[PDB]
Amino acid sequence: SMEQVAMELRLTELTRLLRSVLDQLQDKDPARIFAQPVSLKEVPDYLDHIKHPMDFATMRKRLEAQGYKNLHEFEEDFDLIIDNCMKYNARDTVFYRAAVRLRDQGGVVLRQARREVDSIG
């Protein structure tokens, strides 16, 4: 149908905007601490601590399959990256500190993304 196509164009455009959001958030992680999944070879107990692992590569795979229906779903995954790290790692670690800085800097980007998503519809 024509409606299904219009819906698909909306999703494609959301995906374009989320791709730009993702790039901007990932620039706030210049150390690449959050770039890839935590390695279960190197952290064998990780899934005993963290039930829903997340990282920027995993988000990118979902994004490119157009697997984010709305901004809330994308933000959920971004918050998992931060929140998982802040639980697994202690406050005095470069990992925790990196997550705090990513959260703080990412807030700004996400605030305007939400306005753009609502604005463009």
Fold of 1-121: Histone Acetyltransferase; Chain A (1.20.920)
CA atoms of 86 and 96, how far apart (whole Å): 5
Resolution of the model in angstroms: 1.5
CA atoms of 89 and 21, how far apart (whole Å): 26
CA atoms of 93 and 4, how far apart (whole Å): 48
CA atoms of 79 and 54, how far apart (whole Å): 9
Q: Distances from the Cα of 63 to the Cαs of 11, 13, 22, 95, in angstroms?
A: 11, 12, 9, 25
Q: What six digits make up the tokens of 22? A: 């993702």
Judge whether 24 and 109 are in contact, CB under 8 Å.
yes
Helix or strand holding residue 37 (H, E): none
- Tell me the technique behind this structure: X-ray
DSSP character for 93? Answer: S
Closest-CA residue to 116 (of 10, 6, 14): 14
Domain boundaries, the chain: 1-121
Which residues are within 8 A (CB) of 118 and not within 5 positions of it... i.e. 6 or more apart?
none
